[PDB]
Amino acid sequence: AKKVQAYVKLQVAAGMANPSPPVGPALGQQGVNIMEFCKAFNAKTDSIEKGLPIPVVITVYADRSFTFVTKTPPAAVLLKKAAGIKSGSGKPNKDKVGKISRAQLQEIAQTKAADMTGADIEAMTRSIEGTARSMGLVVED
Amino acid sequence: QGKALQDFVIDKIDDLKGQDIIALDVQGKSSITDCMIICTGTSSRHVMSIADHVVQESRAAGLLPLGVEGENSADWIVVDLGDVIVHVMQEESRRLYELEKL
Amino acid sequence: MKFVDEASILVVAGDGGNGCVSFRREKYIPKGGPDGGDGGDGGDVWMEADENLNTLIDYRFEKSFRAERGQNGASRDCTGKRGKDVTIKVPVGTRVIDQGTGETMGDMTKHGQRLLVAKGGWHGLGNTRFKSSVNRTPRQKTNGTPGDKRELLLELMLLADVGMLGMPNAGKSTFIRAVSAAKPKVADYPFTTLVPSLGVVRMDNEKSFVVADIPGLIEGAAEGAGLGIRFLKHLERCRVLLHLIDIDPIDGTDPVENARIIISELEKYSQDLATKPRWLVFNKIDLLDKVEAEEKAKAIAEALGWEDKYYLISAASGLGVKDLCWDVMTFIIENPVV
Amino acid sequence: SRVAKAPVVVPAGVDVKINGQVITIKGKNGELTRTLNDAVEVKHADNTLTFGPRDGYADGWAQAGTARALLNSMVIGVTEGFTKKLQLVGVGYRAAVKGNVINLSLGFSHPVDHQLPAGITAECPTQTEIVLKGADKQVIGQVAADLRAYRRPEPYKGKGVRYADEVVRTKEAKKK
RNA sequence: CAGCCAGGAUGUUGGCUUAGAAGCAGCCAUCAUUUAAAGAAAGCGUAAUAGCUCACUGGUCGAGUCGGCCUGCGCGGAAGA
């Protein structure tokens, strides 16, 4: 989040094994190796859990390897494995497609290590629900 | 410059697979050319391509060719080197015309 | 290097000219002969073939082609002029389909030969053509017949004798980067191919080895990153077809065990084109052991069920490409159409 | 109009001589003079330069505002000058400057020699770059345009001679 | 008002009856966490990462500026031997 040299992030999942059909070798071509996806990337993710997609920046200037740090996984996947349905919309707004709870996505949204905008707890409480209830859900906060 | 030019022709004609080469002497029978060289090409494009080689080599030899005939038809193509005239043309049409009797 | 578009054209044949009704009474005598003879035959739309063009982009922009109507009759028995023949220039390798009788009327295979797709009209007849003594007043006329109203649907297939079908970015475009002049954009990032391309190999005079490359697709009628299935119709006409499977991909699917699907994908179109014979060649061997690949290639070819002569060629560095260079000619020249 | 209301500032050491409607702008890096349109009134105040219209002229302020624009451009030329950069892109495109003549091998059957005016010079930092240098914008603009007209950039690959700031869009016709 | 120097972000590749669509003809709410403001959104457009601009805001010179109506007189429409 500094300047040019094209910060990028491509992912479908972190638990599986770098698929070719969905993204392929598009995970780096200007100094990023394709065999290093399981050398240093699988240093802290493999020790906790493998069920979520994960974005990451590259941030390589001229080095053969990479020198980036992992960050939070997206909140758009917490609505599938931890909140309810997997497939989703169907007809997005012909009826009341989904259901959410106020206690839901409270501790799940707080598991992020460090990626915040403001230290207030009340302000960030309704930050995640912006991604929510755009799916055709009903809010009962 | 009598014997030199055909030897300058035979060596270059054999470099690009000039098969069945005959050295003729038409001195006395015809009063238009000193001698003619007869040769066969495998394909029409082969005759067309080899025609460029002899012209380009002739233009690099100082002498200017006096005429070419290959135009949208590669069955019969000839070029002029002044005294010496070479006949690069197809085998199929060679039986129709005379050989070694002109 | 650029996009491809195929569309349908609307062509109308010119109707014949109309007869004219008039009389010749010039200066002093009111009672004189009639004027107005033949009309004019309508224009004929022809199908011109050009080897200079490859696409049909100029057909959606102007879709209606109006053949000139036959000129009408005039006084003093001035017969009309025949409608000029408008010629539509089409790249070689097009099919013609008519609405209604939706079959193929002609195949565009030889350049420089013309096809007639719209029969012109017939000229009318004036009163001079109908002058009589029974009527004592010839003033009747015949209209020109309407032209042949045919609508053409154009399907394009590029002129190529050797085809290219295989896994996404498995070496199909790298093979084009051989002694062949054509050099599409080739690398090891994803599919990388958005344009069908063909090249030539020059071995000897009057020896053509036109080979075309088309984008491939995975898991049958499915698309990965926006690439449609319309690239397939450029195939299914070439006289010889070859097939390659990537070996030991870094992230790709498993070996030829998966390529059993590809046979179903080729069978998926309508009938696998009566099960056209296939030739298998490999690629990307220089990254492995040649002595070890010998047992690999023999074992993997018998795994799927192909008991014919296969090819083990590393075309990335242009090693061992010459064996495929001459054997293809023996298949072509020695087996003409019969 | 109102542009002429703001006077143009000239540096020290440059002399402005007015003999009616002709103005003299002798400076460090040039020797040139230019004449007015007879419809503008100019005054020689302190180290600025003011302009105004003339009574009885319908155009009036419109021509007066032009006086500031041209004369401001004359200030930079006589002090630092104006520089224009021309680049040649493509295989076989070679450029060189011999004296007051630029020899251009633009793929023609014969070489092209361009005769520059008295107060315009060119340098060749590399074989594919021409640096136009001058003190008057009018003359330097046309000579660059005259140089550009020989090998006008074709819009498909950008091949030709182009300005430094200019960008040429590439488009595909007869898609395959 | 228009110029000139900047920001133009975080959930956020927003999921998706999505074959891909990261802002783009399908899909929806159109909210929302940090600030001086910056849109799940304005476009030129790659096969997708994209390359850059704009909407809104800050600073700079400083006094007029913005876009609608009616009407007189004016231009194109107006090429032949």
From Swiss-Prot, chain A:
A UniProt-annotated Pfam family: Ribosomal_L11_N
Gene Ontology MF annotations: large ribosomal subunit rRNA binding; rRNA binding; structural constituent of ribosome
Modified residues (N6-succinyllysine): 71, 80
N6,N6,N6-trimethyllysine: residues carrying this PTM: 3, 39
Record GO biological process: cytoplasmic translation; ribosomal large subunit assembly; stringent response; translation; translational termination
An example Gene Ontology CC term for this record: cytosol
SMART domains for this protein: RL11
PROSITE patterns for the chain: RIBOSOMAL_L11
Keywords, comma-separated and alphabetical: Methylation, Ribonucleoprotein, Ribosomal protein, RNA-binding, rRNA-binding
Transmembrane segments: none
Modified residues (N,N,N-trimethylalanine): 1
CDD domains from the UniProt entry: Ribosomal_L11 (cd00349)
Stated role: Forms part of the ribosomal stalk which helps the ribosome interact with GTP-bound translation factors.
Self-association and partners: Part of the ribosomal stalk of the 50S ribosomal subunit. Interacts with L10 and the large rRNA to form the base of the stalk. L10 forms an elongated spine to which 2 L12 dimers bind in a sequential fashion forming a pentameric L10(L12)2(L12)2 complex.
Family the UniProt entry places it in: Belongs to the universal ribosomal protein uL11 family.
Protein name: Large ribosomal subunit protein uL11
UniProtKB/Swiss-Prot annotation, chain B:
Matches recorded under InterPro entries: Iojap/RsfS/C7orf30, NT_sf
Gene name linked to the record: rsfS
UniProt keyword terms in alphabetical order: Cytoplasm, Repressor, Ribosome biogenesis, Translation regulation
Family listed: Belongs to the Iojap/RsfS family.
Molecular functions (GO terms): ribosomal large subunit binding
Observed phenotype of the null mutant: Cell viability is dramatically reduced in stationary phase, cells have a 10 hour growth block upon transition from rich to poor medium. Protein translation in stationary phase is derepressed.
Protein localization: Cytoplasm
Oligomer status and interactors: Interacts with ribosomal protein uL14 (rplN). In pre-50S ribosomal subunits interacts with uL14 (rplN), bL19 (rplS) and ObgE.
Species in which this protein is naturally found: Escherichia coli (strain K12)
Keyword check for Repressor: yes
Name of the protein: Ribosomal silencing factor RsfS
Pfam families: RsfS (PF02410)
Gene Ontology process terms (BP): cytosolic ribosome assembly; negative regulation of ribosome biogenesis; negative regulation of translation
Its biological purpose: Functions as a ribosomal silencing factor. Interacts with ribosomal protein uL14 (rplN), blocking formation of intersubunit bridge B8. Prevents association of the 30S and 50S ribosomal subunits and the formation of functional ribosomes, thus repressing translation.
Tagged with keyword Cytoplasm: yes
Swiss-Prot record, chain C:
Effect on the protein of changing residue 237 to C: Increased sensitivity to HU upon overexpression, supports normal growth, no effect in mazEF/relBE or tonB deletions
Domain OBG-type G: from-to ranges: 160-333
Domain commentary: The C-terminus (residues 341-390) is not required for either 50S ribosome subunit association nor 70S ribosome dissociation.
Resulting phenotype, residue 173 to N: No effect on persister cell formation upon overexpression
GO BP terms: chromosome segregation; dormancy process; negative regulation of ribosome biogenesis; ribosomal large subunit assembly; ribosome assembly
Record annotation: effect of changing residue 314 to P: Severe growth defect at 42 degrees Celsius. Decreased levels of some ribosomal proteins, altered PTMs of others
Binding positions for GTP per the UniProt entry: 166-173, 191-195, 213-216, 283-286, 314-316
Gene Ontology MF annotations: DNA binding; GDP binding; GTP binding; GTPase activity; guanosine tetraphosphate binding; guanyl ribonucleotide binding; magnesium ion binding; ribosomal large subunit binding
Record organism: Escherichia coli (strain K12)
Signal peptide: none
EC number: 3.6.5.-
Consequence of gene loss (knockout): Essential for growth, it cannot be disrupted.
Polar residues bias spans: 129-145
Ranges where the record places region Disordered: 127-147
Designated name of the protein: GTPase ObgE/CgtA
Domain G: 162-284
Keywords: Cytoplasm, DNA-binding, GTP-binding, Hydrolase, Magnesium, Metal-binding, Nucleotide-binding, Ribosome biogenesis, RNA-binding, rRNA-binding
GO CC annotation: cytosol
Phenotypic consequence of residue 85 to N: Temperature-sensitive for growth at 42 degrees Celsius, defects in chromosome partitioning
Positions of Mg(2+) binding: 173, 193
Impact noted for substituting residue 25 to A: Slight increase in accumulation of pre-50S ribosomal subunit
From Swiss-Prot, chain D:
Family per record: Belongs to the universal ribosomal protein uL6 family.
NCBIfam families named in the record: L6_bact
Function: This protein binds directly to at least 2 domains of the 23S ribosomal RNA, thus is important in its secondary structure. It is located near the subunit interface in the base of the L7/L12 stalk, and near the tRNA binding site of the peptidyltransferase center. Gentamicin-resistant mutations in this protein affect translation fidelity.
InterPro entries on file: Ribosomal_uL6-like, Ribosomal_uL6-like_a/b-dom_sf, Ribosomal_uL6_a/b-dom, Ribosomal_uL6_bac-type, Ribosomal_uL6_CS
Name this protein carries in UniProt: Large ribosomal subunit protein uL6
Assembly and oligomerization: Part of the 50S ribosomal subunit.
Residue runs in coiled coils: none
HAMAP family (UniProt xref): Ribosomal_uL6_B
Alphabetized Gene3D superfamilies for the sequence: Ribosomal protein L6, alpha-beta domain
Top-level taxon of the source organism: Bacteria
Annotated keywords: Acetylation, Antibiotic resistance, Ribonucleoprotein, Ribosomal protein, RNA-binding, rRNA-binding
SUPFAM superfamilies for the chain: Ribosomal protein L6
UniProt GO BP: cytoplasmic translation; response to antibiotic; ribosomal large subunit assembly
Keyword Lipid metabolism: no
Entry's Gene Ontology molecular function annotations: large ribosomal subunit rRNA binding; structural constituent of ribosome
GO CC term, one of those recorded: cytoplasm
Modified residues (N6-acetyllysine): 43
PROSITE patterns xrefs: RIBOSOMAL_L6_1 (PS00525)
